[PDB]
Ligand binder design. Structure first.
Ligand SMILES: Nc1nc2c(ncn2[C@@H]2O[C@H](COP(=O)(O)OP(=O)(O)O)[C@@H](O)[C@H]2O)c(=O)[nH]1
Length: 472
């Protein structure tokens, strides 16, 4: 009885397939279906973003993952990101073409498009299965439900019924847990993550009250003193003082491990702490991604092997940061900046995150990291940010844009970058800046000004302008 997570591109059929499967044989976070070949359960929330977030806390609540693609407009970049996320942990991947109920959409380019992703099918090399399904039409459910269990061909031992409570939390709305090992008879003391309580309500997916929990079945518990996190682990204790002592020891241990990760996980400590140095790469364009991947694929043979575990085009989404945290890798943003959630995750944990705007710099830094004598605190710094709120261009010289300066100081003697959607578009120099039509040469923090950049008039609303100095 494995655990299934649905993964795929947006608007491809993940929710539709999950709903059809549930209806064939009240949203809490998980559900289960009984089949003659064997019971199989699914998690309500699909997508790799939620899958890796709980992965990052060592939960490992996945057994088999299924990709859903479409015969039309198939294998989009998010599908590649999802398969990367599934392979980083390491699980068998079962793929399924969903929209095979379209006006002659051929499920043939999908196979040889996904083949060049280490998802080689059976008829090609014999590595992964391919199934035609259709949530709308209904043809293909039986094949998928047989293949999900057929490809689950590991020992699958343990999960002993008579065992102490051991499960993982899913959704802390009252909460829900999908227990891995043991039984969850109500009334006994329970330690759910950093939390203590007693089992008073033990509702099921359909709301029918029960008292016993299956080996790999979900259950919604209610009665705890509050709300734990979404990736913690739950067990059974006996003494409330024991639970409190365990909670305080967990505070101490987490506070120690955060500093240990922020220390050893930096790029500067690669040689000291093989080890198969992992990196997570983000680039502004596909060419600068492929070139960097080809350069970083081979670097050092006898000592340390560098393998890229990510690779995407756009800003540093919090899913990318969660993947890097789970894989304990090093961020690498080439001409791309992080978002708010990525900034939050990087601030919380260690997450060595360094930016670059030159291809050679990344190879140089990685070579020194493998060598072990790299220099620290180099390659410029950020000294000011402004947000563009209005762009006006008179028909005599149109380059001025109104900007609100946020958390920094913008000046005239330093080069600038202009970026949209956390992606840079131009890196030149500052031509003019003025307040109240007065040509001031220094704008403080929190102020408002009018900025015009030389030899570039394309600024729009909601941009960002960063000012930096090459300091060595
Ligand atoms: N023709 C056809 N349309 C489908 C099929 N499956 C899903 N759809 C449509 O595609 C959309 C899928 O959206 P959905 O998967 O729920 O969004 P997501 O959860 O963000 O991926 C739905 O609005 C359906 O109407 C199918 O097998 N055939």
């Amino acid at each position: 009885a494995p655990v299934v997570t649905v993964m795929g591109h947006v608007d491809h059929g993940k929710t539709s397939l999950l709903d059809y499967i549930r209806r064939a044989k009240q949203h809490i976070g998980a559900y289960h279906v009984e089949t003659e070949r064997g019971m199989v359960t699914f998690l309500d929330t699909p997508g790799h973003a939620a899958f890796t977030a709980m992965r990052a806390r060592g939960a490992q609540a996945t057994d088999i993952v299924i990709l859903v693609v479409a015969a039309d407009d198939g294998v989009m970049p998010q599908t590649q990101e999802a398969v990367q996320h599934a392979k980083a942990a390491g699980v068998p991947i079962v793929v399924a073409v969903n929209k095979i109920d379209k006006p002659e959409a051929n499920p043939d380019n999908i196979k040889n498009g996904l083949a060049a992703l280490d998802v080689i099918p059976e008829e090609w090399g014999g590595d992964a299965p391919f199934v035609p399904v259709s949530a709308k039409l209904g043809t293909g459910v039986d094949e998928l439900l047989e293949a999900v269990l057929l490809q689950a061909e590991v020992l699958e031992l343990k999960a002993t019924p008579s065992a102490p409570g051991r499960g993982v939390v899913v959704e802390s709305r009252v909460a829900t847990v999908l227990v891995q090992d043991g039984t969850l008879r109500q009334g006994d003391m329970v330690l759910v993550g950093i939390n203590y309580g007693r089992v008073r309500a033990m509702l099921d997916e359909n709301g029918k009250p029960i008292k016993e929990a299956g080996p790999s079945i979900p259950v919604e518990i209610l009665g705890l003193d509050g709300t734990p996190d979404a990736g913690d682990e739950m067990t059974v204790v006996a003494d409330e003082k024991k639970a409190r002592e365990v909670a305080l020891f967990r505070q101490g241990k987490f506070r120690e491990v955060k500093l240990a990760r922020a220390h050893a996980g930096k790029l500067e400590n690669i040689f000291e702490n093989k080890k198969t140095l992992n990196i997570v790469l983000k680039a502004d364009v596909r060419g600068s991604l492929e070139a960097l991947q080809g350069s970083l694929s081979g670097l050092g043979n006898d000592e340390v092997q560098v393998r890229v575990v990510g690779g995407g085009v756009g800003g540093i989404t919090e899913s990318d940061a969660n993947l890097a945290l789970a894989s304990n890798a090093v961020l690498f943003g080439f001409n791309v900046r992080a978002d708010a959630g990525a900034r939050k995750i990087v601030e919380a944990e260690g997450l060595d995150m360094r930016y670059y705007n030159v291809i050679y710099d990344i190879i140089e830094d990685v070579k020194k990291a493998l060598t072990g004598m790299l220099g620290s605190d180099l390659r410029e710094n950020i000294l000011g940010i402004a947000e563009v709120r209005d762009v006006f261009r008179s028909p005599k010289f149109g380059a001025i844009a109104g900007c609100m300066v946020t958390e920094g100081m913008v000046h005239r003697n330093r080069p600038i970058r202009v970026l949209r959607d956390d992606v840079v578009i131009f890196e030149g120099e500052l031509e003019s800046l003025r307040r109240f039509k007065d040509d001031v040469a220094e704008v403080r923090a929190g102020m408002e000004c009018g900025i015009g950049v030389k030899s570039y008039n394309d600024v729009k609303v909601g941009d960002k302008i960063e000012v930096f100095e090459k300091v060595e």
